[PDB]
Amino acid sequence: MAGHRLVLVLGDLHIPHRCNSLPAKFKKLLVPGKIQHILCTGNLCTKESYDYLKTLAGDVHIVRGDFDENLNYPEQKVVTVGQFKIGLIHGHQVIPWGDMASLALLQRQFDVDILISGHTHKFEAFEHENKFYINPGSATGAYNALETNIIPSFVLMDIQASTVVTYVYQLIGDDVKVERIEYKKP
Amino acid sequence: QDLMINNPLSQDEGSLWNKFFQDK
């Protein structure tokens, strides 16, 4: 397992106004000393949650959600991890939410292999036009302005060579379900 | 293929990732 890069992807926590904490079964998995980078879609919404992320990994990347208190977070970011250029945006900018053509234009504009967005509180992990799209969902299962019964989720990317293995963690009541999706750069 | 065991955050004894982190 040496030479892998593990990247946590999460957001739409909405602590403390909608939720008080990540779920206990998620905190049991999210332990220090494993994850190298964190890419957060935003909506923390306060420093308490940022400080929590810093306990998991030193390298924490956040973009500005519509409800974040911290107006210094950037609107969007592009990072390179391994062979992959990765875009990050919270996604309230996309109307209607999750709109494929909108996201595909961002992919082009950012010039990224993988585009990460949030806002919908619905996980996504799929390939379109040989690019990869991720949405980690809401790690706390916070409601959104359209939806009340949200499954908590987060994502972990395992990046090695020209492959990313994307793990999706979902809390179904209080049992965890994991899914794996592989993407290989063309 | 049980992804509860086979994922990088697995806390399962049998997990290869778990084994990897144990070595420190």
Dist. CA A69–CA A64, nearest whole Å: 9
Least Cα distance to A65 among A106, A117, A101 occurs for A117
Instruction: Quickly list H helices, A35-119.
Output: 47-56, 100-110
CATH number of the structural domain A1-186: 3.60.21.10
Reported resolution in A? Answer: 1.5
Q: Domain extents for chain A? A: 1-186
For A1, other C-beta atoms within 10 Å of its C-beta total 14
Mutation choice for B interface testing from A25, A35, A167 by most B CBs within 10 A = A167
Distances (CA, A) of A74 to A41, A61, A66, A155: 11, 9, 12, 21
**Cα atoms in the 13 Å half-sphere on the side-chain side of A102:** 12
Show residues of chain B in contact with A29, CB under 8 Å.
Answer: 9, 11
A120 Cβ contact partners less than 8 Å away, ≥ 6 residues apart: A91, A97, A98, A135, A137, A144
**Among A1, A34, A179, whose Cβ lies nearest the Cβ of B16?**
A1
Q: Which residues of B1-24 are buried (b: 16+ CB within 10 A; e: fewer)?
A: eeeebbbbbbeeeebebbeeeeee
* CA geometry: angle A14, A145, A19, nearest 5 deg: 25
Tokens found for residue A95: 């109307």
